């Protein structure tokens, strides 16, 4: 009964060499692509990377693996998948990629009996995405997935999307491990690259991410604000208390540069300063500012000593001085 | 390598036209096959897409349910159906080969519908 | 859609020197434009692919040059059978063309 299908694939694969592309003296191959996102892994922007599950397909025509049956489609398993050639697809930015084998290698063969071939396979690609943080945390990357041909020159295998280019990548809807970013669309091309070796056929698929700011509202912003608003309060105190204006402006002190020091982790040790690292930088001039005033107070003091004048007008123009800053950094960052 | 398309047609405004082109050199299930409208003086408009492996069909929103694509695997041969003739379509009409990097390689020689 | 806005309608120059062509496009369409020409009583045939890929039989005086949204084609001493209309594609998305470009004396 099951002998029929067998003498099939053992005709498939009597006199065939997998060590030889389809058409190796006659022509091109072109190998067809396309790939399903199945989860948009988390971005780590300490190690400038970010991870992705995808279902990667492939087809291309094998000549050789033509055959007349009473099945138009032999969906076979992954031991098929070894014993005839395969397009040698890297991926040129990946760092670290697994293809997932439990329970068994998890991947796909179709040979229709015309000699078109599909190949999926799950993926969990880790690829490089140079990041370009000097607009962090309201930046927007665009992550890129490169993949090629090792050792297969244009001359040899080129790729192409299976459909139209604007729906070859395909996203979840519930596919989205992203859990600081949001994926605001994909987007592809396809280039000519050269190396050493020859020049090779490469795909480019660009994720367009944006980063959004509500950690680090509450994280550094807030926190910083709040530090000044402390400080700002430390100027309707009494004149004299030399003791307790100086613990407001020590505590500042203190608690700005350790705000300082904590808003550094998990983004990368960049030569270049942030958006973020310069509302640091304004807001700890602003409280160094109250512990200059309340030194220039404590020199001027000495049948009772009266409310000071650089009081008066530190009560005013320091919250204001704020006040235009703050319009002044948050139009010049979130509006374009 | 060749596509060959029919004759020039005249028929009534208001008629239905059927209008044909065989693909030789290939075979039509590798590579999509594009219909495009050439009104004359003026520029390319793209009718409609078929993949005739998959059946599947994709149409332009001005071109919706007044034309349609049919293809056929034995005569390896794609068709039209034009309905609703009208003084605006009068035109010449190609059927397009999709080639590397998806860029219309093969054009049929074009096809003169006129009404009256 | 994508809306293809190549300039001019026409041009009218000689034979022997350098004429390009500008090709916008509304929407990102990234190295998938194509470039035709187009003879009187004649179909389309291509000339570039990609963004900048010379065609099979393409003389090397015609030369393309692409981007993201911006597009020329570069024209290097034309004769006078290269005298026809030409026409601006893209296929980023489902295809459309733009108006077209002609070539006079």
């Known amino acids: 009964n099951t002998t029929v299908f067998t003498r099939i694939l053992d005709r498939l694969l009597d006199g065939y060499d997998n060590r030889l592309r389809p058409g190796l003296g006659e022509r091109v191959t072109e190998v067809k692509t396309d790939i399903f996102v199945t989860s948009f892994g988390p971005v780590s922007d300490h190690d400038m990377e970010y991870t992705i599950d995808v279902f990667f397909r492939q087809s291309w025509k094998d000549e050789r693996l033509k055959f007349k049956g009473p099945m138009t489609v032999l969906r076979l398993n992954n031991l098929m998948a070894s014993k005839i050639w395969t397009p040698d697809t890297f991926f040129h930015n990946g760092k670290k990629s697994v293809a997932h084998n439990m329970t068994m290698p998890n991947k796909l063969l179709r040979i229709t009996e015309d000699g078109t071939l599909l190949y999926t396979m799950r993926l969990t690609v880790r690829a490089e995405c140079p990041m370009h943080l000097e607009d962090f945390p309201m930046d927007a990357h665009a992550c890129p997935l490169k993949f090629g041909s090792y050792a297969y020159t244009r001359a040899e295998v080129v790729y192409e999307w299976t459909r139209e280019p604007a729906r070859s990548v395909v996203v979840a809807e519930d596919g989205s491990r992203l859990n600081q970013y949001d994926l605001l669309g994909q987007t592809v091309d396809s280039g000519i690259v050269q190396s050493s070796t020859g020049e090779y056929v490469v795909m480019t698929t660009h994720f367009h991410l944006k980063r959004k700011i509500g950690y680090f509202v509450i994280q550094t912003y807030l926190p910083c604000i709040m530090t000044v608003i402390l400080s700002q309060v430390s100027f309707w105190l009494n004149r004299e208390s030399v003791p307790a204006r100086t613990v407001f402006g020590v505590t500042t002190v203190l608690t700005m540069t350790t705000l300082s020091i904590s808003a550094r982790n998990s983004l990368p040790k960049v030569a270049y300063a942030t958006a973020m690292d310069w509302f640091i930088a304004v807001c700890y001039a602003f409280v160094f500012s109250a512990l200059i005033e309340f030194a220039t107070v404590n020199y001027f003091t000495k049948t009772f000593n009266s409310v000071s004048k650089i009081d008066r007008l530190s009560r005013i123009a320091f919250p204001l001085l704020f006040g235009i800053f703050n319009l002044v950094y948050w139009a010049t960052y979130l509006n374009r | 390598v060749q596509l060959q398309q029919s004759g020039a047609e005249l028929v009534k405004p208001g008629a239905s036209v059927k209008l044909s082109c065989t693909a030789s050199?290939?075979?039509?299930?590798?590579?999509?096959m594009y219909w495009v409208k050439q009104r004359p003086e003026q520029g390319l408009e793209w009718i409609g897409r078929?993949?005739?492996?998959?059946?599947?069909?994709k149409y332009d929103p001005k071109f919706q349910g007044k034309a349609t694509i049919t293809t056929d695997t034995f005569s390896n041969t794609a068709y039209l159906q034009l309905s609703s003739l009208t003084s605006e379509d009068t035109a010449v009409y190609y059927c397009?080969?999709?080639?590397?990097?998806?860029?219309?390689?093969?054009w049929g020689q074009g096809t003169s519908v006129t009404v009256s | 859609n994508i809306v293809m806005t190549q300039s001019p309608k026409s041009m009218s120059m000689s034979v022997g020197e350098r004429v390009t062509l500008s090709c916008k496009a509304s929407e990102y369409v990234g190295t998938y434009v194509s470039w035709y020409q187009q003879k009187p009583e004649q179909s389309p045939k291509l000339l570039i692919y990609?963004?900048?890929n010379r065609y099979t039989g393409v003389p090397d005086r015609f030369t393309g040059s692409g981007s993201a949204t911006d597009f020329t084609l570069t024209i290097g001493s034309v004769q006078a059978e290269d005298l026809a209309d030409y026409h601006c594609?893209?296929?980023?998305?489902?295809?459309?063309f733009g108006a077209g470009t002609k070539l006079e004396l």
């Open positions: 594609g893209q296929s980023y998305s489902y295809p459309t």
């Open positions: 050199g290939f075979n039509i299930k590798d590579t999509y």
């Open positions: 990609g963004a900048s």
């Open positions: 397009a080969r999709k080639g590397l990097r998806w860029a219309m390689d093969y």
């Open positions: 078929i993949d005739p492996a998959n059946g599947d069909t």
